[PDB]
Amino acid sequence: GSLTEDGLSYKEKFVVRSYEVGSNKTATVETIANLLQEVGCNHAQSVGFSTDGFATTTTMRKLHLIWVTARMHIEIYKYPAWGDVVEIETWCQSEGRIGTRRDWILKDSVTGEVTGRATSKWVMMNQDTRRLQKVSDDVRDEYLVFCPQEPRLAFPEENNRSLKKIPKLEDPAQYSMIGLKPRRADLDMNQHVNNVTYIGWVLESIPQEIVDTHELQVITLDYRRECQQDDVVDSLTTTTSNDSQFLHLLRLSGDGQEINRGTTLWRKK
Amino acid sequence: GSLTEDGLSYKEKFVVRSYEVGSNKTATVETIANLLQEVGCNHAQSVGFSTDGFATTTTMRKLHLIWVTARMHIEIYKYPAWGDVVEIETWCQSEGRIGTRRDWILKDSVTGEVTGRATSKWVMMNQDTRRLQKVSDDVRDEYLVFCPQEPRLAFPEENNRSLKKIPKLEDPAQYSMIGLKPRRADLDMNQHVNNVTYIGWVLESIPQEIVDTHELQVITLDYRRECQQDDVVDSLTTTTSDSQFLHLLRLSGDGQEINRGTTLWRKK
Numbered sequence A: 001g002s003l004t005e006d007g008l009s010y011k012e013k014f015v016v017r018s019y020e021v022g023s024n025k026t027a028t029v030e031t032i033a034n035l036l037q038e039v040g041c042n043h044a045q046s047v048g049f050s051t052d053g054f055a056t057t058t059t060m061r062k063l064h065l066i067w068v069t070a071r072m073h074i075e076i077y078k079y080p081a082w083g084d085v086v087e088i089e090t091w092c093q094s095e096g097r098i099g100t101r102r103d104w105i106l107k108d109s110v111t112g113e114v115t116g117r118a119t120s121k122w123v124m125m126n127q128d129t130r131r132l133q134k135v136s137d138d139v140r141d142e143y144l145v146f147c148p149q150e151p152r153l154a155f156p157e158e159n160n161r162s163l164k165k166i167p168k169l170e171d172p173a174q175y176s177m178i179g180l181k182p183r184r185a186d187l188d189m190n191q192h193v194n195n196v197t198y199i200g201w202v203l204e205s206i207p208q209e210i211v212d213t214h215e216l217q218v219i220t221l222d223y224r225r226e227c228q229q230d231d232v233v234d235s236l237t238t239t240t241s242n243d244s245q246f247l248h249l250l251r252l253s254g255d256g257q258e259i260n261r262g263t264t265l266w267r268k269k
Numbered sequence B: 001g002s003l004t005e006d007g008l009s010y011k012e013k014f015v016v017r018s019y020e021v022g023s024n025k026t027a028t029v030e031t032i033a034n035l036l037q038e039v040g041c042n043h044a045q046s047v048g049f050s051t052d053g054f055a056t057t058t059t060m061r062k063l064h065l066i067w068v069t070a071r072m073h074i075e076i077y078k079y080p081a082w083g084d085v086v087e088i089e090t091w092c093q094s095e096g097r098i099g100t101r102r103d104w105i106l107k108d109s110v111t112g113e114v115t116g117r118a119t120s121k122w123v124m125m126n127q128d129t130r131r132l133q134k135v136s137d138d139v140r141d142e143y144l145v146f147c148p149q150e151p152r153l154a155f156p157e158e159n160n161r162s163l164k165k166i167p168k169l170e171d172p173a174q175y176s177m178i179g180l181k182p183r184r185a186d187l188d189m190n191q192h193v194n195n196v197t198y199i200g201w202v203l204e205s206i207p208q209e210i211v212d213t214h215e216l217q218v219i220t221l222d223y224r225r226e227c228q229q230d231d232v233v234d235s236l237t238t239t240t241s242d243s244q245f246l247h248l249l250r251l252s253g254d255g256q257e258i259n260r261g262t263t264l265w266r267k268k
């Protein structure tokens, strides 16, 4: 991988592995999500930020501040097949004092066609107290020189799926998968549950018939609270709808504390 | 990746990814195991066998026969760090009618030093009845031209760790992790639980203090029965001692054994 000519974005190629594909012999959305975080990590390494998933500056480290994902939105047109080369371009943009946005474009290396796109909203949080705060000028200015000055959006559409408010699923859910627990492979280098694990937990409650007859086209996931290594999660899904649409909710098995909410859109195969 | 000059082994390089490392900032043994199966799959693709994890011939496909892992033995001296390039060489060898063996050597691309090694025993099974049928001459002859004729072993030492019989853990276990279930990411393209998932389930019952103060050096795992998508597993561990542990994976309900293994850990 490498930064592009203008140094304002980063590109990297990946060959899809045998264990990275599902029943369709194409990459799963969880493999895609892991590749997005990987290209994001290499972009931060290439410009001098931390490479632990938080992409911090020395000033942020002194204040015990980190970047945390608030929303992840992914839209896939064609999942790359086993052995195919996928090229991913990523860039960041400040959204004022609210937070920052990281965008991605996925392309088929051979045809040059756009096969997918993603966007993510990130907020600054103190690592210890878990309290959010609006981005300071001192921190904001350190990042501006690595972002495009003019707006560059993976999702430019006037009223697009990445900015819709997600409602809260009401009991009883139509479908559920109960008692989901992370194992050591779900933890990152910082011993926190990997963001991609929550995507897998959301999809655990989609019925098998949908997985067999449809392809996942869009997923939007909000991150409200973190699942600890010793927490147990319940995954809830209800149909909201040719195309099928679902409302999702992840909550702690015990008290019902919300950790995530999302929506998925599936198209008939 | 590519077959070597003599066409009797396959080599491939990998750059260790950020999500592939643990708290030591080096590749986990599960990332290593996935890279071993990946290089194994590319070796079969390069010579015309199936690329679904079973490495079958057209004759085996007509008879509904597949290769299944009976034993996996891995020894790591240095886990590759995030961003490092690891090179893996793999080869196969027939062990008569019993089955076949796949071996691997892991090297640091920059120093050329051997950082790990692995060996695995595979048996032929009818995919429908689950009955082991032992290798026929017709099938054996199809594979021989892709293997070295002289013995080439990743573990040559006479009577080494890869060939020791593993005993059955007796209740009560010293440690346990109960109610482990596979999710869709643990399934392969054939909707079967990936062999690497069982390695993770075995390690789930190692106490946190051991993980914090020791490094995993050796793991030997026997595969007796597979966990179905709707099965629930219990992971049991007892100290047998460096630290050494005896392991057992069994179905949560009736206690049917699916795997047994041993691990050896060295102080950091």
Ligand SMILES: Cc1cc2nc[nH]c2cc1C
Binding pocket: A022, A027, A028, A029, A030, A200, A203, A204, A206, A211, A215, A216, B184, B185
């Ligand atoms: C878990 C899961 C992952 C996927 N990746 C692409 N389509 C998918 C469908 C499901 C159900």
Ligand SMILES: Cc1cc2nc[nH]c2cc1C
Binding pocket: A043, A044, A047, A049, A054, A055, A056, A067, A091, A092, A093, A100, A143, A146, A147
């Ligand atoms: C956190 C962050 C990391 C980055 N890496 C490259 N541009 C970036 C911009 C931001 C805001």
Ligand SMILES: Cc1cc2nc[nH]c2cc1C
Binding pocket: A184, A185, B022, B027, B028, B029, B030, B200, B203, B204, B206, B211, B215, B216
């Ligand atoms: C799960 C696990 C995976 C590892 N990989 C290397 N050391 C390890 C230790 C544990 C506990």
Ligand SMILES: Cc1cc2nc[nH]c2cc1C
Binding pocket: B043, B044, B047, B049, B054, B055, B056, B067, B092, B093, B100, B143, B146, B147
């Ligand atoms: C199954 C099998 C697959 C192989 N791929 C390359 N050599 C091989 C030898 C065997 C036995």
